[PDB]
Write a protein that binds this ligand. Structure first.
Ligand code: SF4
Ligand code: SF4
Ligand code: FES
Ligand SMILES: [K+]
Lengths: 230, 55
């Protein structure tokens, strides 16, 4: 047997080689907070929300990009893990605009949910926030780039699954904007799925925009009939 | 308070207690209906250092 045993919160579990920390933590039925990791996209490791602490190791590792080894003990509820989560949440909410009432992601927002669950309760940022120029990328995806957090799921989706290679990250530093650098109309057969993978309200559905709110919607499962994929 | 002295005397005799010193009708001793604007204090965790939520 090539499988190795690792430890999470003092509990042993048996994982495969090449398995990251987050996959083992999901194997023991816990969810490490994340913004840029996706189970169907490549690992970017830039949001730094998934930082956890391995014991006897004075540096936090990214659980979405660190392979495990035999004998490792992972503390997912220690003090420094919560401190790192609060710091990353504060940095993410430092430049986020006060647009929650007028944003369609409200009620199903990842940023709000993990800010309540793992972030702090007040903002120490007393300066003026940034403002990003909006873009027009088609008649289906309403775009407001001021609310983006540079998670780069746009980029990986456009370069790996859709394979259109139109989206990119222009500029350097905090002024870097996720866009196409020109008035490029991003149209493809799988464009609207980016609205699924945006954790913030930067990309929204244009026909659905300013129409409803997720907490008052009943969900009924069904099958598509427009195409024969089912 | 605007009652006459003979009515006050009959009232005090009939009650047996001094009624004008403790009147049940409110008068100009009450607080005014308009107030200066207040400035509320802050809570004990309104701090910029060592204010982590895990503590
Ligand atoms: S995306 Fe931003 S504005 Fe919209 S609900 Fe989330 S935190 Fe609020
Ligand atoms: S617009 Fe949304 S999905 Fe695209 S990079 Fe920004 S946060 Fe990520
Ligand atoms: S989920 Fe690991 S750095 Fe973003
Ligand atoms: K979205």
């Amino acid at each position: 047997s090539n499988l190795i045993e690792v430890f999470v919160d003092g509990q042993s579990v048996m994982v495969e080689p090449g398995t990251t920390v987050l996959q083992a933590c999901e194997k023991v039925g816990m969810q490490i907070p994340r913004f840029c990791y996706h189970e169907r996209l490549s690992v970017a490791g830039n949001c730094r929300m998934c930082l956890v602490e391995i014991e006897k190791a004075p540096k936090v590792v990214a659980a979405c990009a660190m392979p495990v080894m035999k004998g490792w003990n992972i503390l997912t509820n220690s003090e420094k893990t919560k401190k790192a989560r609060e710091g990353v949440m504060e940095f993410l909410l430092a430049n986020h605009p006060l647009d929650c009432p007028i944003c369609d992601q409200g009620g199903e927002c990842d940023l709000q949910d993990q800010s309540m669950m793992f972030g702090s309760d007040r903002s120490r940022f007393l300066e003026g926030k940034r403002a990003v120029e909006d873009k027009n990328i088609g008649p289906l995806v309403k775009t407001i780039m001021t609310r983006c957090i540079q998670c780069t799921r746009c980029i990986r989706f456009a370069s790996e699954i859709a394979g259109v290679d139109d989206l990119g990250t222009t500029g350097r530093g905090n002024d870097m904007q996720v866009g196409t650098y020109i008035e490029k109309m991003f149209m493809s057969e799988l464009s609207g799925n980016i609205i699924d993978i945006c954790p913030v309200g930067a990309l929204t559905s244009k026909p659905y925009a300013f129409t409803a709110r997720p907490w008052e919607t009943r969900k009924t499962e069904s099958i598509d009939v427009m195409d024969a994929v089912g | 308070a605007s009652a006459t002295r003979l009515i006050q005397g009959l009232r005090n005799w009939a009650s047996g207690r001094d009624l004008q010193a403790k009147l049940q009708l409110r008068y100009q001793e009450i607080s005014k209906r308009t107030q200066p604007p207040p400035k509320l204090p802050v809570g004990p965790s309104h701090r910029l250092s060592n204010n982590y939520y895990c503590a």
